[PDB]
Structures are given as C-alpha cells and as structure tokens.
Amino acid sequence: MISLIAALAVDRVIGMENAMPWNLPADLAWFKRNTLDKPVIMGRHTWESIGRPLPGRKNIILSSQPGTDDRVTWVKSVDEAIAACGDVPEIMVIGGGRVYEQFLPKAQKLYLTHIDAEVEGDTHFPDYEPDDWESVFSEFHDADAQNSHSYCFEILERR
C-alpha cells in the first residue's frame, strides 16, 4: 500500500524546510516514527533539501534525469518506483508537490500534520475529497517552548 506523509500549512501550502517558518521537532519526530524502516519516495527537489539519505529507510528518488549520488536509488517513473520497493507492506511518499500528485490516486492512507501557520507558497498539497477519506486519528497540540506553532496530526484512510 502507498501512503503519503506531509506537513501542511493553511491553504494546504507545503514547502521545503528552509522555506517553512515553523520549528516543529514534535512533527519531525512523528515523521521519523512513521517512516522508519519503510522505503521513502521523494522528488529531486526534496532530495536536494534533505542533503543526506534518511537513515534506516530505503531512499528512492523519482527523477526523469540521471541520478547523481550512489547513496540512493534513482528511478524514472512512478511504476518503477513501486517496483523498486519490493514486497513491503507500506511505502511512504514524502513529496514534493508534483510527487504527491502523482501518487495520490494510488494511495490508501494519508498522514497529515496541519500546522496553524499562514505562509506564502507556490506549492500546495493536492486537493483531496474529504468525502473520500475517513479520519481515523486526530490529535491536537498547542505550541510550546520547543514547538513554534500549534499543530494537529491526522491519519486518513481511503473509504
């Protein structure tokens, strides 16, 4: 099964780390926890922002063009990407925007962090029809000394 994971601001805006104005260790801990030991698929731009392979995870980069780093697995198509994951129970799609869009229709679960922040951005997470998804977990957190803004973690499953 394919699952998408992402941190959304108001308006479904998403953006790279440095582009994002919040500092949320709790959300990074959640991302870590839900992706560990699973293969992760990301776009080139995401790969470049991350800087190094995420440890304990098979890193697959979807890109039309040739790879430039032997530490990760380069694939050229969405099908190729799934094939490279092998026989695993859950594949995590970590963005960015275009990658999310390509995998949404194949996805069965979404792990979302809704951050209470207004920020400008080009990029938005794909529109998904709420009636087509069921919320199975939600949990609100206020901001604190460590965490810049308030957030709500949510897990949705395709009905």
Ligand X SMILES: Nc1nc(=O)c2c([nH]1)NCC(CNc1ccc(C(=O)N[C@@H](CCC(=O)O)C(=O)O)cc1)=N2
Site residues (vs Mn ion, CB under 5 A): 70
Q: Which is nearer to Cl ion, 15 or 96 (CB)?
A: 96
Q: Exactly one of 27, 39, 47, 107 binds ligand X (CB under 6 A); which one?
A: 27
Task: Give the Cα separation of 78 and 96 in Å (integer).
Answer: 14
Q: Which is nearer to ligand X, 71 or 87 (CB)?
A: 71
Q: Exactly one of 3, 46, 59, 113 binds Cl ion (CB under 5 A); which one?
A: 46
Determine whether 71 is exposed, middle or buried from the number of CB atoms within 10 Å of its CB (0-12, 13-18, 19+). exposed
Task: Give the Cα separation of 20 and 8 in Å (integer).
Answer: 10
Total of chain residues touching ligand X, rule CB under 6 A: 19
Q: Which residue is nearest to ligand X (CB)?
A: 152
> What one-letter code names the amino acid at 107?
A
Q: Are strands 151-158 and 133-141 parallel, antiparallel or unpaired?
A: antiparallel
Q: Exactly one of 15, 43, 113, 154 binds Cl ion (CB under 5 A); which one?
A: 43
Residue 3 binding Cl ion, by CB under 5 A: no
Task: Give the Cα separation of 20 and 12 in Å (integer).
Answer: 13
Residue 93 binding ligand X, by CB under 6 A: no
